[PDB]
Amino acid sequence: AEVTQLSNGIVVATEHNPSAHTASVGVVFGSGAANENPYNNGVSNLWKNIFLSKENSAVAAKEGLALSSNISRDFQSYIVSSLPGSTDKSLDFLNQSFIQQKANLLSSSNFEATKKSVLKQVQDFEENDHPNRVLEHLHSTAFQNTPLSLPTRGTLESLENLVVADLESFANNHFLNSNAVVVGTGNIKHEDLVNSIESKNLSLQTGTKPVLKKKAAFLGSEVRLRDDTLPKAWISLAVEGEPVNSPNYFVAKLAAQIFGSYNAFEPASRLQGIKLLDNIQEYQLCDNFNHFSLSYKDSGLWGFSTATRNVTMIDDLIHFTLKQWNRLTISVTDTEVERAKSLLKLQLGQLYESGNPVNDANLLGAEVLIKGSKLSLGEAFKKIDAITVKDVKAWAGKRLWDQDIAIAGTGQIEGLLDYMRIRSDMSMMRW
Amino acid sequence: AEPEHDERKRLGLKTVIILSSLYLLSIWVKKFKWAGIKTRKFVFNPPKPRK
Numbered sequence A: 001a002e003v004t005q006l007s008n009g010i011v012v013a014t015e016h017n018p019s020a021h022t023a024s025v026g027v028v029f030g031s032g033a034a035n036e037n038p039y040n041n042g043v044s045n046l047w048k049n050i051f052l053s054k055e056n057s058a059v060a061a062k063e064g065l066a067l068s069s070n071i072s073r074d075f076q077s078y079i080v081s082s083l084p085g086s087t088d089k090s091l092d093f094l095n096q097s098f099i100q101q102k103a104n105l106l107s108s109s110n111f112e113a114t115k116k117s118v119l120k121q122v123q124d125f126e127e128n129d130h131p132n133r134v135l136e137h138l139h140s141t142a143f144q145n146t147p148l149s150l151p152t153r154g155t156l157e158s159l160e161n162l163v164v165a166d167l168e169s170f171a172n173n174h175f176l177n178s179n180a181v182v183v184g185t186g187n188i189k190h191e192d193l194v195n196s197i198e199s200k201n202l203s204l205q206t207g208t209k210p211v212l213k214k215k216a217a218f219l220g221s222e223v224r225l226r227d228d229t230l231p232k233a234w235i236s237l238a239v240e241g242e243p244v245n246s247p248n249y250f251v252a253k254l255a256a257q258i259f260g261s262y263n264a265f266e267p268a269s270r271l272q273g274i275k276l277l278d279n280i281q282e283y284q285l286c287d288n289f290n291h292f293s294l295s296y297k298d299s300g301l302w303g304f305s306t307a308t309r310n311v312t313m314i315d316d317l318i319h320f321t322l323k324q325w326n327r328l329t330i331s332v333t334d335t336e337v338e339r340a341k342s343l344l345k346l347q348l349g350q351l352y353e354s355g356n357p358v359n360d361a362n363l364l365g366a367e368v369l370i371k372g373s374k375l376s377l378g379e380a381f382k383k384i385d386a387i388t389v390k391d392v393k394a395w396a397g398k399r400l401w402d403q404d405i406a407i408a409g410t411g412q413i414e415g416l417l418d419y420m421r422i423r424s425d426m427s428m429m430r431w
Numbered sequence B: 001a002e003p004e005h006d007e008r009k010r011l012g013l014k015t016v017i018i019l020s021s022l023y024l025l026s027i028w029v030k031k032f033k034w035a036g037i038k039t040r041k042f043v044f045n046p047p048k049p050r051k
């Protein structure tokens, strides 16, 4: 496995892997949910559904290929999987889809059907999925009045205020030749390297992406969605993280991995880990853990999430988690760091070793749209091994000791102290 | 009748100075840490009609 790079007007990337036999080729745009004003929120989701809606029959009829999509914060990706010997067909279909012509794909009936389907889907998401809801609310409350807080699926009222003008405007303003790459993950050697760059076989509308007046921000805002009908209580915490291409990415990832995950209803999860697991097992407080270290091109979010059937025990859980975070920055045994390093090595190996071509293409585009070339796994392992106790202690002291935090919650949140009791528990303790 | 007037007034001046400083300090801190609770806003969205 190796990475190649080249450019003429556009950028072309490829990570050949002859072991797998599922070639996937598609484009990736560096403009998603972070490049849209709050009055135009679900335009990217409408694009995704309108490319997943109607021509999905044509792709399976005329040829054989399964087409996917993904929008996370700015990486609007349209991957077209295929068989190893049928990549040119996928590229030709992608060209006939984007560059010419999208007028047929933009009709009144098709758009109305996509609109009602998207409305039903977003309503269902807002009804059922609670942890994702609290994650989106944490994002929307940490980045108040900033093009990084609005959700990636579109607020309910924002959908029905845009039909054909906003969608085409987004296409003409973001689907450009400056922030687009052509991934080639699979088992293709050099056809992607040559056919992507042609006299006219590239996206039209040469130009530049509009600049953003506001880069990012982070203020400690609290949001609650108290409602006693739900049985459980989902709460999330976060602090300021680091963006991609910073010499703190892997240290933050290791700090997240130190505490790891947990699941009380699994016999293999109650007997491992670090101290807070032991402190929690004595009384049934929590059910799930998710120590996440998210990073975006502007700013990151290193946080925590949980969900408890017990409602009176929320304060104790939050206090114990904050106390453990406090202990992280003063005294960590070298054994803890070694175990966290091994666990993170395994985790990144699983993440970057999965046989899915689509996930590898997504990661490749994500890491190439910011730096220019993907950071290989061997170098990643070497620099992971470079980390020591001093570096993680320094990062924890810099980014955790008495820093502004954001909180979110929903369900039975009657027993959650609002903002000063939680914030005070990071420096009031004897040090 | 009161052989402590000078000492009483000196101690009283010191006491009123220190208590005035403490009172202003408490004013500032109370207006500070109540700022996050005196500004929180509520929005009522009627729930969907299904018990």
Ligand SMILES: CCCCCCCCCCCCCCCCCC(=O)O[C@@H](COC(=O)CCCCCCCCCCCCCCC)COP(=O)(O)OC[C@H](O)CO
Pocket (backbone or CB within 6 Å): A315, A316, A318, A319, A417, A421, A422, A424, A425, A428, A429, A430
């Ligand atoms: C007008 C009414 C009051 C009149 C006067 C009252 C007189 C009695 C005073 C009783 C104690 C109140 C004085 C101030 C207490 C500070 C708060 C405190 O100690 O309690 C915290 C307890 O804090 C701790 O448990 C950690 C800090 C203590 C560890 C460090 C100790 C240092 C040395 C202490 C010496 C004193 C020992 C006796 C303390 C009672 C609670 O907050 P928390 O950090 O637990 O946050 C809440 C969280 O969500 C749930 O935990």
